[PDB]
Amino acid sequence: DDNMRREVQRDLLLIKHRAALDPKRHYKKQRWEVPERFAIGTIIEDKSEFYSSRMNRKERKSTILETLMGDEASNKYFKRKYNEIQEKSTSGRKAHYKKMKEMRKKR
Amino acid sequence: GGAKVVIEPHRHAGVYIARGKEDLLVTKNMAPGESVYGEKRISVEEPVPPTKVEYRVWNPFRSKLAAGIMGGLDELFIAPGKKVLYLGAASGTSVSHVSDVVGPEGVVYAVEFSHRPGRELISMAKKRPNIIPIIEDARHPQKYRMLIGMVDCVFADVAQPDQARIIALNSHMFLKDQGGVVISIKANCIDSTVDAETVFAREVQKLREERIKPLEQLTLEPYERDHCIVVGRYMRSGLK
Amino acid sequence: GLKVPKAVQKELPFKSQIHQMKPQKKKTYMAKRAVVLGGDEKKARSFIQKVLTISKAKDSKRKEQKASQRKERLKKLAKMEEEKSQRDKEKKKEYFAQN
Amino acid sequence: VRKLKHHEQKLLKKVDFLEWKQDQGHRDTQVMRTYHIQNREDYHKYNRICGDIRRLANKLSLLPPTDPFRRKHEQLLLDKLYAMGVLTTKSKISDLENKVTVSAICRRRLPVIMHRLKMAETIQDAVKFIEQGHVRVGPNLINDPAYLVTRNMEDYVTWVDNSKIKKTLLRYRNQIDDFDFS
Amino acid sequence: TRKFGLVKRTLNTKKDQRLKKNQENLTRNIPQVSSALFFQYNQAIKPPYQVLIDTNFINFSIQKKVDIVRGMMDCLLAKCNPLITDCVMAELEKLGPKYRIALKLARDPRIKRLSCSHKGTYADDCLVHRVLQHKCYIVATNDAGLKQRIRKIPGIPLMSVGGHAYVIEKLPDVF
Amino acid sequence: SRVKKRKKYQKAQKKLKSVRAVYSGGQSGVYEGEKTGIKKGLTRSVKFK
Amino acid sequence: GPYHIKYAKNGTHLLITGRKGHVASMDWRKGQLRAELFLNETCHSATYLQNEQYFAVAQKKYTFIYDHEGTELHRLKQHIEARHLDFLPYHYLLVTAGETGWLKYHDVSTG
Amino acid sequence: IKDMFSSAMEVARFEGAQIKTVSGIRGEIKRALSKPEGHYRAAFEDKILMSDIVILRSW
Amino acid sequence: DDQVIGKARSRTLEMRLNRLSRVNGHQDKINKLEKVPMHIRRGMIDKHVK
Amino acid sequence: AKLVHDVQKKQHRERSQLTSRSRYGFLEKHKDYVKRAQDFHRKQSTLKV
């Protein structure tokens, strides 16, 4: 229902925009609109092998978004990449225009 | 390892994709609560309260049929209501995945000739009731012609040089008309004096000589060197 | 932006009329009512925004780079097709000149 | 009618219960669907006049190419049909065989003129409006859809005053002056 | 309280599915390039080669007095298995009683023979399909159109009667 | 002349991963997943005739 | 106007035509009509063809042919003034006569 | 245009000459202005900017 | 010409245009036959040959 | 480059705004002017429409 789509609506956005989560992962080009019938499930790593794929009890979370937010290297990359996209996008638009005008005006 | 995925139905009916940051080929679990060969599982809570149903990761490096699915086959004939005759059910590795793709309303006849794999097949077919284990040589289908009737797809994971004769005998006995014939050909186990394309061309020619029209072949190369899946249908009258 | 004059845009046809909506000056009740969540929810909002703009700027970089690729492939492809057509229109005249 | 099998479709190929050869591909139906023509016989009443124009155009092109009778009557017929609006260009005389057409006479009808003048959103809306008696050409109210509007007579296609449609377009732009009733 | 713009209902040739031209009421497929191939090398073929013959290759062999298996052997310096498809054989039989010599030289126990499964006897279509399916075949031909088809599809060596012996082109290990 | 063919063969066998799918050597460790995506619409298999 | 009556060759369907315009094809023994069409010119006669699924009506001048639900299939440019229509069911022929002194046989299957 | 000339006599000497900005906008000098001395009126291909320099290429 | 009335004029002009266009135009494109059915074109040919 | 020297197809560097005339920032050159002019022309074209 829409009541559950309004709870998993963020990690579906993360899976849609997989390609810009890690700068080294580089998926194959699909579109992936939200499928009509899906189900959100949790991986059971069993009690046979330890320590390799094991995410412990102290760091298991409830979405993909909390894991990506708990990752501190991804936070470094997202903040840095967002600041450089920001200062590229505000490169010559309006603060530049009015500081050029104030440069003309000051003398 | 404790992460969360989204399950999504594949193009093929009965099999699914779990999307995360690496996406997994996944089937529903017919016997929930245990793994068969140590694969990982996914437990969804589907909505009396909701019930925890679960799913099993199909490993393409331990299954020729999963290597074929995720290399991209236009039509598998293993479908969610069908009957599959698995030849060379070497353990319960791929037979479990074929079994729960086929579902509770369909039947998988798992034919194997060795006996310790047969013991593991019977102990797996306890918790998967839609598996009929048949411990017999597939080179003589008359020795088990009484136990199986009118299958819809044959899958052949035998690795013997008389493969095409085994496939033809089992198809002529138990396959129905315009049913599925999925073959996993291993070039080195057929013969190693010629190259892989020569032995695949000869095996496809043998299939159409035994009137199984090939629709499609796939090399399944990143998972197995010099393998192939040939998907055909049992035409029985008029390959033309 | 394109600033179309008011004397022109009041005298436009019905299909060509320009939907320009005025800003809101009154603190309306639905805006003063509506709740926003804080802390973990506002950092989730910040995270989703950063992820979506990184995805959109990566896609724009990729399609601009593909535009720069395919204009020069168009250039070399048109040169090779011009050389080919020159060779065809001289071989045809050779053929007919012999026959 | 039952999707004949192979032996039946081979054995009776010319059988067709809908499309016949005298139908001419249902083009009366086709252009009366395009331009929303009420009565069945307007296509053929126009087809007679197109056949008159093309019969005269044949019999007039069969004259020698330089005599002033042929040149005068070809130019005179070309001018008359352009002024009436059936022909869209009075340049070449092959229009008198090729471009003279029931669809051209049907594009000159009153609802099609209306729809091209943006006076109604579709030809069926224009039919409904001039049936409801909103449209006058000149001073006098025109009531039937089939009215053919020549080139000089399409400058006077307006709405009647005291029309609710005229009132709502004026009040949409709130230029409604209630002194002159709208 | 009638409706306005009333019309006579006729049939719509654009819409009505009862008539025949309106009886016309995704998964892609990009076939992977073969694992037998390097870029254009075809690294997988190895002697004993197997060579698909067609009818003008046989006719030019008899016109130039080259034996089939011995001409193949001293062209490639390898052991050859020549293959006559049933459509090439059908074409040689359809050539009439002028070509009896060519037909009963194609009837040779040293020349093995495949079994094509299609309708019609178009050998160029059959040879092109079964060679671009598998890439384990040499094509021996002298048709200009078939030579252009085969040398446009990659990794397929092409043999042809030229002069008084066979020549081979797209096989990069001939000496 | 030797280092040039060493570095245009490394380029060639990096391009070969693009056109085909190259058998890299099998499953390295635990099966992590497909790591690049799964397309349910594309079928990269050779159909007959 | 006065209603020309016509029954299908098994008695299941009735086809009435008013003189003014009112043509109705109906299942007279259930209460199911399947065509009621008001063709405002003076109709004269009608007949079924091989079924209740097609019927031919003789209108002001031209004979028209309508399908089961009453959409017009054909306007016959011959059959200039019919007053009498009759179908020949073993031969599939619509026979037409009227104010002209002409008798016209029209094959319904081929057209 | 402000200072390439020192006097209206100099501009009168150079009337009608083709100038251009550094943007390649071509132009022509038309008439010396009266009260500021070396200042003149030029006409260009389109609107030049305040951050430009005009150029009279002589030899 | 300037004295040739109808059917002679149409067929005369058509004959001249055919004879001019048969040099550079293609032989499969200059003389297009009118589409006549098989069983009546063959009867036309048989009666004309008779 | 068939008969051209690489010391001949060098890189001519572009000049900056004069420091006396520096409050009107960025002396604009022909690429900047064409970016200005075609913008003005497309906006005048849609205004005329």
Ligand SMILES: [Zn+2]
């Ligand atoms: Zn063949």
